[PDB]
Design a protein around this ligand. Structure first.
Ligand code: THP
Ligand code: CA
Length: 129
């Protein structure tokens, strides 16, 4: 896999963000995770967490996996990095997302994220509390 540039347009929620990619506005849905909706328990904390991570970043990068790059809603499917740190993994590590939506072919970082989830669960963080 490889990282490509993007710039923030707007934070949306825990697991979606609007980025300019190849000079076009796109909504990205983070691979391999599920954050609670804003109206759900931990939804606001997830949203805030992703917001801070992407807004404070000097450098946003997107990393597509080997499979489909857009979902059925037209959302980009990617790993998103903020100054080198993967948002997807950071959410899981903090107990603010569950590993989820692991589809064959877009699962390169699955075991990395599962490892993070195990550690969040051990620590009884957030969702796992
Ligand atoms: C993360 C992800 C979601 N989706 C689709 C599956 C779900 O369809 P349904 O809308 O039919 O439930 C939806 C979940 O996204 P949200 O968690 O953002 O709602 O997004 C994919 O198709 N591929 C993916 O990799
Ligand atoms: Ca969600």
């Amino acid at each position: 896999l490889h990282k490509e540039p993007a710039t923030l347009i707007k934070a949306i929620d825990g697991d979606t963000v609007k980025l300019m990619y190849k000079g076009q506005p796109m909504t990205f849905r983070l691979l391999l995770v599920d954050t609670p909706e804003f109206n759900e328990k931990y939804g606001p904390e997830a949203s805030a967490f992703t917001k801070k991570m992407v807004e404070n970043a000097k450098k946003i990068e997107v990393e597509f996996d080997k499979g489909q790059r857009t979902d059925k809603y037209g959302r980009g499917l990617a790993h998103i990095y903020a100054d080198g740190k993967m948002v997807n993994e950071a959410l899981v590590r903090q107990g603010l997302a569950k590993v989820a939506y692991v589809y064959k072919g877009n699962n390169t970082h699955e075991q990395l994220l599962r490892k993070a989830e195990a550690q969040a669960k051990k620590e009884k963080l957030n969702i796992w509390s």
